[PDB]
Design a protein around this ligand. Structure first.
Ligand code: AQ4
Length: 278
C-alpha cells in the first residue's frame, strides 16, 4: 500500500542524482531502519494540487510488476518527496557506459525483453509512462532491470498542453513526433521511446541525435532521419528499432509483440548482436 510519511520518518544521506525538477537521494526509512531512494521535487515544480498528486501517488503505488518500480511512500508538504526501494547497481545508462568491454549479447537482449514486459504491464493497466529512457531504467541485478519514474511526467504536468514550465526540459529526443507537435501521449508513443531506449543500450549509452539542438528534431524527423544502425546491431534488430519510429502510431509494433520478437532473439544472442570478445 501507499504509506503517508512525516519528515521525521526518513533521512536523506547522499545525493545520487540531480535534475531540473528535483534531486534523488540515498537515504533511510524508519517505519527498524531500511535503505531507500528518495526523489525530492523542488517546490512549485508541479502544476497539480495536493489532492491530485495524492491520487496519482496511489496509482504509482498500485503498480505491481517485477520490471517496474513501485512507490512505497510519499511525503507531502510544500515539496513532494517520493520513496522507492534502493537499487544496489543503479541506473542502466551509467552501467552500460562503465561496462562496455564486459557486456555480452545475452544481457542486452534480456534487458530489452524486460523493459517491454514492464511497458506491456503498464499498457494492460491503461497507464502511459510518458518518459521512457535509459536514465529511467534501474538495475536490480545485471539479469534484472526495472522501469522507474512512472507517473512523474504526469506530476510534472507533461500531459497538460497549456502548461509551459520554466527551466523545465522536455525529453524531445525521446518523443514521438505527435508528442513533439501535439503533445499527444499514447501507448504507441511510448513504443517510440522504447525504440530510442534500445538504441541507447546498443550504442552503450551514446547520446541520441548528438550535436543536433532540440529545436530541430521534429523537422529532421519529418525529413525521415532516424538514429543510425548501431555498430553491434544486425539489421534484424535494427528493423525492430526502426519500426518503432513510424509516423503512423498504429503501425508501430505493440509491446506485446516486442516481447515475443526480442525473446526469440535472446535465445540465439550471437546471431543478432556482434560484440568482440563474447
Ligand atoms: C523515489 C524515487 C526515484 C525516482 C526515479 C529515479 C530514482 N533513482 C533510483 N532509485 C532507486 N535506487 C537507485 C539506486 C542508484 O544507485 C545506487 C548505487 O549504484 C551506482 C541510483 O543511482 C543514480 C544514478 O547512478 C548510477 C538511482 C536509484 C528514484
Amino acid at each position: 500500500l501507499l504509506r503517508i510519511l512525516k519528515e521525521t520518518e526518513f533521512k536523506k544521506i547522499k545525493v545520487l542524482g540531480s535534475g531540473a525538477f528535483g534531486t534523488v537521494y540515498k537515504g533511510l526509512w524508519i517505519p527498524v531502519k531500511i535503505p531507500v531512494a528518495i526523489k525530492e521535487l523542488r517546490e512549485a515544480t508541479s502544476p497539480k494540487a495536493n489532492k491530485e498528486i495524492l491520487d496519482e501517488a496511489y496509482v504509482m503505488a498500485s503498480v505491481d510488476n517485477p520490471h517496474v518500480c513501485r512507490l512505497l511512500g510519499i511525503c507531502l508538504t510544500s515539496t513532494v518527496q517520493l520513496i522507492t526501494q534502493l537499487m544496489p547497481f543503479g541506473c542502466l545508462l551509467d552501467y552500460v557506459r562503465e561496462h562496455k568491454d564486459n557486456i555480452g549479447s545475452q544481457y542486452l537482449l534480456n534487458w530489452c525483453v524486460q523493459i517491454a514486459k514492464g511497458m506491456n504491464y503498464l499498457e494492460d493497466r491503461r497507464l502511459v509512462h510518458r518518459d521512457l529512457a535509459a536514465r529511467n531504467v534501474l538495475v536490480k541485478t545485471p539479469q534484472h532491470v526495472k522501469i522507474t519514474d512512472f507517473g512523474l511526467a504526469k506530476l510534472l504536468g507533461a500531459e497538460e498542453k497549456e502548461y509551459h514550465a520554466e527551466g523545465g526540459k522536455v525529453p524531445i529526443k525521446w518523443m514521438a513526433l505527435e508528442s513533439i507537435l501535439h503533445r499527444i501521449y499514447t501507448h504507441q508513443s511510448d513504443v517510440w521511446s522504447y525504440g530510442v531506449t534500445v538504441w541507447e543500450l546498443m550504442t552503450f549509452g551514446s547520446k541520441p541525435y548528438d550535436g543536433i539542438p532540440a529545436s530541430e528534431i521534429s523537422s529532421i524527423l519529418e525529413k525521415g532521419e532516424r538514429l543510425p544502425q548501431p555498430p553491434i546491431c544486425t539489421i534484424d534488430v535494427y528493423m525492430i528499432m526502426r519500426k518503432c519510429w513510424m509516423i503512423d502510431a498504429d503501425s508501430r509494433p505493440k509491446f506485446r509483440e516486442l516481447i515475443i520478437e526480442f525473446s526469440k532473439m535472446a535465445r540465439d544472442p550471437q546471431r543478432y548482436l556482434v560484440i568482440q570478445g563474447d
